[PDB]
């Protein structure tokens, strides 16, 4: 038998209780950006990736990548079909 909500007054019954899922300190992960939160001239060296903007389409390409993965499988199939058909013809 398994118990999870009450806090039994018998300690012998307390032993039966299921160990409850502890949380994770989300603030600890937040600290990485809080270390990024140091006020600094973030061109700390003349790093052209900061100086020249990226393509904002990389975030768009990231969303298109998932579709491109689906497309890549179909493209690989279609390319293979042409290669199979042509190699068969070129077997002779």
């Amino acid at each position: 038998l398994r118990l999870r909500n009450y806090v039994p007054e018998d300690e012998d019954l307390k032993k039966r209780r299921v160990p409850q899922a502890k949380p994770v300190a989300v603030e600890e992960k937040v600290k990485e950006q809080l270390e990024a939160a140091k006020p600094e001239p973030v061109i700390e060296e003349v790093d052209l990736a900061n100086l020249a903007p990226r393509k904002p389409d990389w975030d768009l390409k990231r969303d298109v990548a998932k579709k491109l993965e689906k497309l890549k499988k179909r493209t690989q199939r279609a390319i293979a079909e042409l290669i199979r058909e042509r190699l068969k013809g070129q077997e002779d």
């Binding site: 038998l1 398994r2 118990l3 999870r4 909500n5 009450y6 806090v7 039994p8 007054e9 018998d10 012998d12 019954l13 409850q20 899922a21 949380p23 989300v26 603030e27 937040v30 950006q33 809080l34 990024a36 939160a37 140091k38 006020p39 600094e40 001239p41 973030v42 061109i43 003349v46 990736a49 900061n50 100086l51 020249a52 903007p53 990226r54 904002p56 975030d59 969303d63």
Partner: protein, 366 residues
């Protein structure tokens, strides 16, 4: 001790003499020891009769009678008479014909027990161990309708619904418990809810979580809001537009505690600093110099100007230093003038070093 008849009599005398309303030491503690003595003697039916008499008592507080009802259940658990334990708690939970308050002292103490957190939580543990899923869930439904539930009990219920793999109901349970409660409490309820959702169903149907994030942000106190802004913008970085993440970061600069806002301005600058950085942070630095206090403004002014130096915008850079010079007392802030001098030596010229000194000496006069 060692003289059972004397022990039995003095319990009876204690029960007769002690007024619960004047009891120094809570009266149920007598009843527990009274029942325990018979239980130690194996006289379980007499102990039950003691517990029955105990339930008839209208004690000073509901917690006294509630603790008795627990001991009624706990006795049967030790002797594995689990059906009787359920039966007792069914009678304990059993509603008055009125929709009675937990607090109305004119009502009998027995009536008030129906709301009690301890009794319902115990009965819930009984049903989950012994009985069917739907009957167990019906306890939680009553608890929610009666507004008894703590967020921990919701989290227990949520995990229970995940073990029975009806996660849609589990999300409904989180949503109901958010709707009942108020800040700060709601913060941790959101965190557990979002964690569960993002794993299985955040992959599947992303957009509902954005709206759910938006609902979570509503009225949120700044420390918890700060966490939620970063988490939402991360999700925006993981699956949405980067441009929306920047907007959420802009909210973080606005809402949060002012000293932490200065930190949040640096996050807003630094995540920009790759892609947006040269274009966007020039806007953010100007805004920050207007908003923030003199110490943080001077730090912002220098690093904005130094960024323009590395850009080569020497005319704009010296304009920022000129505006900064209004705040930089040439006596104490010598580090500012020297780092400006290091700019005038390396980038500028000897007459531009003098130009800084024309600014320095005239400001020092003022």
């Amino acid at each position: 001790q060692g003289r059972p008849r004397e022990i039995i009599n003095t319990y009876t005398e204690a029960v007769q003499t002690v007024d619960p309303f004047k009891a120094t030491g809570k009266p149920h503690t007598l009843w527990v020891a009274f029942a325990k003595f018979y239980e130690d003697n194996g006289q379980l039916d007499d102990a039950r009769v003691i517990l029955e008499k105990a339930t008839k008592v209208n004690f000073k507080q509901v917690d006294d009678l509630a603790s008795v009802w627990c001991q009624c259940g706990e006795l049967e658990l030790r002797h594995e008479n689990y059906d009787e334990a359920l039966r007792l708690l069914r009678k304990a939970t059993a509603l008055p014909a009125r929709r009675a308050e937990y607090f109305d002292g004119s009502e009998p103490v027995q009536n008030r027990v129906y709301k009690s957190l301890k009794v319902w939580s115990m009965l819930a543990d009984l049903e989950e161990s012994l009985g069917t899923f739907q009957s167990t869930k019906a306890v939680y439904d009553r608890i929610l309708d009666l507004r008894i539930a703590t967020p921990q009990i919701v989290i227990n219920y949520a995990m229970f619904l995940e073990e029975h793999k009806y996660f849609e109901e589990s999300f409904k349970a989180y949503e109901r418990g958010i709707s009942l409660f108020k800040w700060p409490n709601v913060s941790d309820i959101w965190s557990t809810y979002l964690t569960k959702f993002i794993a299985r169903y955040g992959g599947r149907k992303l957009e509902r979580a954005r709206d759910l994030f938006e609902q979570a942000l509503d009225g949120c106190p700044p420390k918890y809001a700060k966490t939620l802004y970063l988490l939402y913008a991360q999700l925006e970085e993981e699956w949405g537009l980067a441009r929306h993440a920047m907007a959420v970061y802009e909210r973080a600069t606005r809402a949060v505690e002012p000293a932490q806002q200065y930190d949040m301005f640096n996050i807003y600058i630094k995540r920009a600093a790759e892609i947006y950085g040269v274009t966007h942070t020039r806007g953010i630095y100007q805004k920050a110099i207007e908003v923030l206090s003199d110490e943080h403004a001077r730090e912002m002014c220098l690093r904005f100007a130094d960024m323009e130096c590395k850009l080569g915008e020497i005319d704009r850079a010296r304009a920022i230093y000129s505006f900064c010079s209004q705040i930089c007392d040439p006596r104490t802030t010598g580090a500012f003038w020297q780092t400006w001098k290091d700019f005038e030596v390396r980038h500028g010229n000897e007459d531009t070093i003098k130009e800084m000194l024309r600014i320095r000496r005239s400001v020092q006069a003022t």
